[model samples]
Target chain A: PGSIPLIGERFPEMEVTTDHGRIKLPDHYVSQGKWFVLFSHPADFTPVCTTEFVSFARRYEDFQRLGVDLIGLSVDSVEDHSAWKEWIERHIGVRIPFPIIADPQGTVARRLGLLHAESATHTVRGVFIVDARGVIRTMLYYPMELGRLVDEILRIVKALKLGDSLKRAVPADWPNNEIIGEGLIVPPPTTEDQARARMESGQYRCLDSWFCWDTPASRDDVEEARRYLRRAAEKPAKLLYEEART
Target chain B: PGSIPLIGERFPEMEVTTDHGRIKLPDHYVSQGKWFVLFSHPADFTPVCTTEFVSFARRYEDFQRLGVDLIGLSVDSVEDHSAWKEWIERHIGVRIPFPIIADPQGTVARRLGLLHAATHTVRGVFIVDARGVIRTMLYYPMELGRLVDEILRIVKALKLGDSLKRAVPADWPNNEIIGEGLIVPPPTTEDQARARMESGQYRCLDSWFCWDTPASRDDVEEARRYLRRAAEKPAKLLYE
Candidate 1:
């Protein structure tokens, strides 16, 4: 592999083996105008990843409601993945709905930059979100010990879709973003008078000539658009950690 | 470039001119094990970038309290960057205490592959730990702004994970599944796994996976305070 793909570029088109039937990545989703997320774990049978896979599968319906595809990759065998997926279901009662790619020889791992110096056989906890155009829009990296946050991944997808459909910029910690508090940032005022008018009108919240924003969607729309965020916040609890807190 | 500095690999050692002066990065912070954040914007004097810069300046002390240095980079003249830095303090009255590197040719951005198609640069952020390992990274589309608050949590999460020898869950400290509890390292051996299930010292949903809150809630309490400050300042900044 001569190049490692970065954000803002097309995800490398590859035909690889997964638990599911062989399929062309990015190609399968491109014409359908679908967005897909590909995630990596250090290896099979790790506890942190066990929780994440269960967490991810539990949210499968949520991700599907948004019309997104999920895939997992690691340097392991299909037999190992099959047994582990079954073990998760037997132990935790959550059957994984997505496919896990088996890269036993570190072939896919090398091209994807999954293998690092810290652990050679194991891959890093990484995530890549590819858009409809096959552009790798977002990349996330977590240490081996840290499990990937599935909800944050959903939130990011919601934010990205909104950014494209609404045609406004998303702010930091969005929806709950400190600056705007669920409001979308107005695009930059490119002209001197355009900048000044932002201050004159109630249409925009202008922090300065350069900085301004306004609410783009209704409160109902914002909450609905952030459907998973809402669902995650209203938890039905009393699990081990929840009980452990007491 | 076949490969760029990414998580687990050390950041590319480079010498670039910043507002403070030319300094060798990652190296400057490496020996002392100081954490540093390198972020990029589309340009120096744009709207979202202006908002982000002002936002970052307010959180400078918070980041410093965590032993982290903040640096901003973009493709522009050093003179233009100095002028733009002056512009923020002049208008917003918030002096940017951090350094801004002026890379007219985007030497750093090119190396980092931060330059996207439409814009000269997108919102790319990297957090390199004191050991000079790139611990966490995120790339925002041009329309998205960088969250200093999120960055703070990640740094805290990284440090806490390293020190505690545990895995930090996603949106940790406020995670939906575990709340404030940190996941204990999985038992590697059958003997450890059997002992782990029977251990009273930790909590376990499974024999292999378990979690409990750290004795100190400094990181958790500090995170709450950040939002409190965020709430109070926006109100005060408007009037003053």
Candidate 2:
């Protein structure tokens, strides 16, 4: 079955019961201009999923600091989700402040194409990054055996928001620059001609027509190159080309 | 159109052009039991895609060192793929060591269900484990940039999972301790779960589930030193 909800489409909306009680999605999070990360686990109270929930709980405030909401779902009843939340608090020593949807019948799972084809009772690991406008900006599916990376999830959310607000793209492994949390790569030129001009201008260090790095003019320029190249070694092989090329 | 492939399915095999020339996929990599990372980009020479390709190239040997192969695809011709590689090498300085499929008509893209409706191919990342199973899949829109470290991290995690017969925790970078990889319990009834927890070797939250700490004295010293460096700088923990 072709089950995935493609990106750029509006997130599917439905009324569902969560650990916190019943609520409507998209409409609830969307109306508030809040970004939400809706993810699925195969079952509740499982080891891998428990560790994942605890990790997310630790980072919940980090997400809230950005005004994003986090919700979880699994093919279990609301009662199961509630009991699991309590057990996590008692054992793991962390309160899961987020809401989790109870989807025992795989209703939401099927709607989102998250149900494992071979097993109706289990849901594959799926993460949906929904923008404030309720558009599906990104979706990730992992096999049941793997654990989702919470920090990577946080990074993408931050990247998307920064990109949306600033109209700039973040590069790979985009750590903070001189300014805390600011991206290092400058924006791509608006046009093909501008790219070509930027490459030949000699005022900037350009990797290709489109990718450019800020540079200095001489021994005077030596100081300029160090500004951007300071953390150049910290970047992955992917971003190092911009430095190596220049 | 129901275009995307599902998990547990055998990865489709196809002929493709890369900077290195023509070669068959899965069949080529699978025959030797090699893991392969096959990803799709929207086009050959866009800004975001450019960054991704460079990232992949720089880490190609790392993937190869792990016994994995990397291949890229886009709805572009072999000529375009070749020219882009040359431009990257000429201007960017690092030669992309992997093959890139020249799929001008979206043939492979369609079969893999990566096409973005009527538009060009969407940015899709697929990691096919060593068993030839499509294990992890992610789709990103044009504007969202990907982190390659996550991709590398996944490969190592999967390899360790298979080798150790254990499951990893979220953010469980390759390091950690000797027995830190938690053992996933076999499918069991509620009674069996209770018994499994009482054994006490595992820290059980329930009968069906238990979490474990890293193992005994073997790697204790190494693990501690690693932890010291890790605590000093969290960013250095991203890569090995």
Candidate 3:
């Protein structure tokens, strides 16, 4: 079984009829360099999912400003999707400004392994963040009962964008901006030697050889700090012993 | 292959010797009514696992206070586990006060589907509630280290939901009172739903749906305000 696509692989192409209209992937979303945040709900017009859809709709403009497209999916017909979208707008007054895939047959759900066996008709909550290059960058799975956190999704999008733009790794719980002392960025190391060099660099705050943090100066001063540390490590042991004795 | 045990299933019975000593599951833990927070790391003496071990050890007493047992697993021999425990205590000064199963062959990991591929186990966290029920399961890839704070938050939420017989709200943090219009009870019947709506003790968003703080405070005014706003012109046109 060709399961859900993993990280760094191109998102699988699928023909989808959405509330916004029909569109196919790889060409539709990929060619435009638009990052796609595809999420699934179990059904249309359910309580937990209703709240989730409203929250996503509320953050629609935020995602739009970031040049990301939000595509919602569920195993429901296009008619039901349109009806639900209208009901949401009528009730909550927030426009669902995204295309929702009408996956009534569980076609995409089964392919993505998003189907819940217990609730055979619906799909569990799954999120796939496909980057502008069409590579699946991140995946988050939540059981049917849990509501997806909108803020966390937004934060992750910003983190992924920042990481891609800077060629750095975002730390855990990393919020946007260049603030110090919070979860700092990690310097990208291409090789094991560079990894070691990063630790020695004194550029970043090194918790260990593998774990280091980006300070205001550390990002640019990596090579300088690495040279400094290397020269210091290469010092003869006897000189340090004599100096201590003196 | 029948992978790791699914939610709502009893944790599989297994025999194992740990750093704390030898023990068997479904009896050692289940019979004692202790919640089990079993987790798997890739290997022994790894950097990410080292930080996790220290964090777990630091919070071991906290788990104990909550009557939860912390059991760690990795596809390493008992000897390696013992050596790693000694190193943690000697180097990090955090004594691992819990049992760590030594499954060099990855017998448990394979059964649990915790293995990353053919090589090693990824980090898999399983939270089995006191009733021997697998309540929550989370998997993190090898590169990403687990967050103990999130684990604690989840454990607290599960315990509270179980004890209170209510579902905690989406963003409910631990020790936060249910009074801020949180905590929803199941509306099994229309009569019950109507009774819930008429109740002054809690907040009701819909006739069948309601939220409440703990049993102490009165939120009738707030609940009425919500209802009153809902009953306005657009609301009346929509619902009625």
Best by lDDT: 1
CA error at residue A142 for candidate 3, angstroms: 3.4
Superposition error at B48 for model 2 (Å): 1.6
Best by TM-score: 1
Ranked by DockQ, top first = 1, 2, 3
Against the native chain B, what TM-score does each candidate's chain B reach? 0.91, 0.81, 0.81
* Alpha carbon deviation, residue B93, candidate 1 (Å): 4.5
Interface RMSD, all candidates in order, equals 4.4, 10.0, 22.0
Question: Which parts of model 3 have CA positions greater than 4 angstroms off?
Answer: A1-12, A25-29, A58-68, A86-93, A105-107, A116-123, A132-139, A154-246, B1-5, B25-27, B82-95, B116-121, B173-180, B183-202, B215-240
- Tell me how much of the true interface, by contacts, candidate 3 captures: 0.01
Q: Write the per-residue lDDT of candidate 2 for residues B66-176, one digit (tens) a residue.
A: 789988888888788888888777766657888887787787888788864654437898889766778789787667667675677677767767776767766553211
State the lDDT of candidate 1 residue by residue for B1-240, as single tens digits: 245565677788889998789988789888766899998876877766766787788789889888999999888877888898898788667788899877877777777766533444457788898888788777766666655666776777778878887787654555545666788877768999898887778876677668888827777777545533423313332213
Question: Which of the predicted structures, 2 or 3, would earn the higher DockQ when compared with the native?
Answer: 2
In the range A1-246, model 1's lDDT, one tens digit per residue, is 123566777888898888886868889888788899998876787777876787788788878877788999877898989988987766666689899988876678777876654346644667889989988888776667666657667777877887788888787556665445677777777778987777888677766676677777667656654555444433235443443334
| DockQ, computed on Cα atoms, for candidate 3 | 0.06
* Clash count, one per candidate: 2, 9, 2
Candidate 3 per-residue lDDT, tens place, B1-240, comes to 113455556777778878677888756888898898998886786655665677677667768866788999988888899888887677556678888888877777776666534534346788887778777666544444454544555565566556655554332321111222335654668888778777766554355335555522322232223222212212111001
> RMSD in Å for candidate 2, one decimal?
8.8
